[PDB]
Ligand binder design. Structure first.
Ligand SMILES: [Fe+2]
Ligand SMILES: [Fe+2]
Ligand SMILES: [Fe+2]
Ligand SMILES: [Fe+2]
Lengths: 299, 299, 299, 299
């Protein structure tokens, strides 16, 4: 199917939509945000929303409602986004501007401790960093009190990379969801703790506004207090990691996944080590914030 | 128009008054504060008020009421101050003593994290530090709970400097003030956050004791929570930065601006880079504290 | 006297039982936990309970009840544990897996600040570290609010070691217990403070669920507030250190002590310095967590 | 005038008593505390009280009541203490043991941030550290909530030292006490702040249990909030520093002053710089803790 972009279902799943900005939209966007380097976006957070406005305005204001419709739709909730003409590591700054503009049409990206900024870039080259190790499926933000509504993962560079696809699991594609959701431990608050902060307690499952399951789970930060919790969690982990509903999604340079962190889990497949390997990623995580017609008190 | 000093309106604005201590007052002041090095003022804060008393006493006690009258007068609220005979970088310590004496007749200067002292000196030579970048107009102290009532900015040294004037904007010279003040977002508490502390919430506009607008705004530390706040703030920023009411004030070596931080914004113009450039500044920020005839309870 | 292990009283005391896993159990255990390196146990705490399940399952589920029966039995409360075939420093990782599996059948091991992990390994070679100095008998965990129920001390390596036995004192072997327990200072809360955290207050004696004495004492961290407390504590220290009930227990490589920290004190004897000396230890400390038939409210 | 020591008024003041332990008492003390190095006293605070008991026992238990009588006597409140045979820098450890024993008969010495121990030693050799600068009279402990009851200052070493006497001022020798005590600012809580912690508020004067003035004052840490407080404090400072009641007390190697910090101020005179100068000091500060016949509730 829009003004300034096209939208088509992915080859991995009808739940994941691919949104591509047209060449003209991309050139006009880059022109109109040229006066702010990424460093200005880092220092003045209102500029993150301003570049969002510029991009949405170039799409006849059709972009923001579509992003929101898609991310909040339980049947979908995931986008793979790119702009024609932004597809090489030399354009890293333009990539950051684009992902920033999209994210701040639907919410606000949170401070990232790994970078000290609202986004983090990191390069993979040359236990947790083992190429043969899958990064298991999980939700972000489980070790703080506030809810993380979205995860954004952008491929900045890729050289001599075999494997390393993003892994995704939509809870409604997870055949064994009801088995674990209906267990009493599904709704028991457990301790979550970050590595070097104060521990938080919340269950690994919750519900959305309609009573449907959502998840706040990661194997590294959950801290079972006893043998009962620990054995159950290892069984949950196994059931998630072996689910036949998992998607394996290549993320080419210049594209980014933008997913609803409440009912999508994400991870990363193993990849083959190689001396000339280079992979560069950028991430943002944040909360949704958007207008709706709803009730308020006083004047 | 005083005993020990003269006071005349600036060439940039009738709101900014220029106060010059006479040669005799300056020599007597330096004589009478010679027994305390700046290092004693740093270690014993009562001495900051004592050098204030000495300076005011040399002006027949006319200085303190005039400083207060001027700073608290909504129609003015800004002073450019100097002392005849203190005008060269070699006299940096005498400059610090003079600015200290003036500041502590009207209030108290707060701890400065950049220096670990009640004042900070810094040298500019050789993104935020780009000579071509204007430092946008703002208020100080927006990221703490307590109100900063005054900002003091002193030129200690200037060599091979082209440009770099202090910028000032009195809210009552700002033609578009009412447009932004009457918007609901003007009085919504927003998040303010310092870089490396705990976040504070306050609106960007408030009122003085008479209901007239005051401001607590800086583009770097305000953290709009969503697209609505962020777009509005970018529009406010633009309206402030393009105001025809902005003053451009040269601050020669040995002079200092002392302004009411509630209804003056301040900034700094771009300057031309030059290999032999040297600029040295000193700042103090603090709250007003002064006697008035007003009510009290008990005995 | 079991399926997969044998259990016999020690030569030092009928209160200390020696539990040895059979060669077959050990080989099957190591096979079935081979897919998780120690580093996976460090990163995913649910795996600590999973290796526990694997070991207990290989003992026909007789291991967990026996561990609990022994540790909670006031008449015993201490185990010396080993597995046939795990007895050389090269098998340090297998040792860590074994001690982890045992500990997490009965509870959960707490974060260790010395290592940043749920266990700590340290090597002794080449005032507190004086070989001629006895480490006095004490309880662990006295400087935090939560109770430490068990201490686990494993010998990873021993070369050219003369002396250095573990010292143990069961409160019911301590002839002078009643003398100190019946003193008013026994139940006065005193200050306990760790070295580089917030001070805690608790008495040096308490009672178990049956009203029998337990202890939370260490000479280094207790902080008598005055001459009365300090003199009494020095007398208590002397009475403990000279008790005829103290056990001196060699801990050969691959064996570990697992003791109930409420009514056993532990320490370490002096040893002879030697240029080629090498001793490697591993410790875990934690709380008990186990199922029992007891009352609950609501549904 | 005792068993094991002699007590005589100083040459500077009848308020300062000189207490000297006899040669025999000192030898027996050093013998009986030889089994604990200073390092054991650092690690086990109950040993600080135990060496106190040993010293008091060698004085037929006459020492502790006399120390307390003297320190709590408003007419005196200050001791200069030494032991015959302890008088050379090589005996620094014996000096520390002696001062520890005396201090912990009357109270408990607090943690010292400068050393990380209950006492601090520091060496002077080769603004605040200017030999020509007097350290002004003050009370210790003004920047924390708890009251510091005693200050202990011991001379460990002195070589090529001219000047540098301890300065002391007993509030009842201070002729202008009533002038400042009867001023409203005497009892206004002011802010006190340490350098690199949380600010405390208390007045500079208080009263003892009989309503007589005591002081909690230091010029460096008190933070007058305005011109009124700052000018008054500078006048108080001047009145204290120029008091004709100030004592100038030499502290020879091996002697220590032990003073009641509530109604004695202390300081240090200037000294002449010299290339071969060496001065070593040890300090302890703490609270009183002692038995009295007074009321209690419950049983
Ligand atoms: Fe993630
Ligand atoms: Fe500023
Ligand atoms: Fe221990
Ligand atoms: Fe002092």
């Amino acid at each position: 199917q829009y003004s300034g972009f096209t939208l088509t279902p992915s080859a991995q799943s009808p739940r994941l939509l691919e949104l591509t900005f047209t060449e003209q939209t991309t050139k006009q966007f880059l022109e109109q945000v040229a006066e702010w380097p990424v460093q200005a976006l880092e220092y003045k957070s209102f500029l993150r929303f301003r570049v969002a406005k510029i991009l949405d305005d170039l799409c006849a204001n059709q972009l923001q409602p579509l992003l929101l419709k898609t991310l909040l739709n339980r049947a979908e909730g995931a986008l793979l986004i790119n702009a024609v003409g932004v597809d090489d590591v030399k354009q890293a700054d333009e990539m950051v501007k684009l992902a920033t503009a999209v994210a701040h049409l639907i919410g606000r990206s949170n401070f990232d401790a790994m970078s000290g900024q609202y986004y983090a870039r990191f390069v993979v080259k040359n236990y947790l960093r083992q190429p043969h190790r899958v990064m298991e499926l999980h939700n972000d933000g489980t070790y703080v009190e506030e809810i993380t509504d979205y995860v954004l993962m952008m491929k900045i560079d890729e050289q001599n990379m075999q494997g390393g696809n993003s892994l995704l699991l939509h809870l409604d594609d997870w055949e064994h969801l009801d088995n674990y959701f209906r267990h009493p431990l599904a709704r028991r608050p457990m301790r979550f703790a970050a590595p070097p902060s104060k521990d938080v307690f919340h269950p690994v499952f919750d519900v959305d506004q309609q009573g449907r399951p959502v998840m706040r789970y990661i194997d590294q930060f959950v801290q079972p207090k006893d043998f009962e919790e620990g054995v159950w969690l290892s069984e949950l982990s196994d059931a998630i990691e072996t689910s036949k509903g998992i998607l394996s999604v290549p993320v080419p340079v210049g594209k980014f996944l933008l997913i609803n962190n409440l009912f999508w889990l994400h991870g990363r497949d193993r990849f083959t080590p190689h001396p000339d390997l280079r992979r560069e990623l950028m991430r943002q995580r944040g909360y949704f914030a958007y207008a709706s017609n709803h009730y308020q008190t006083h004047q």
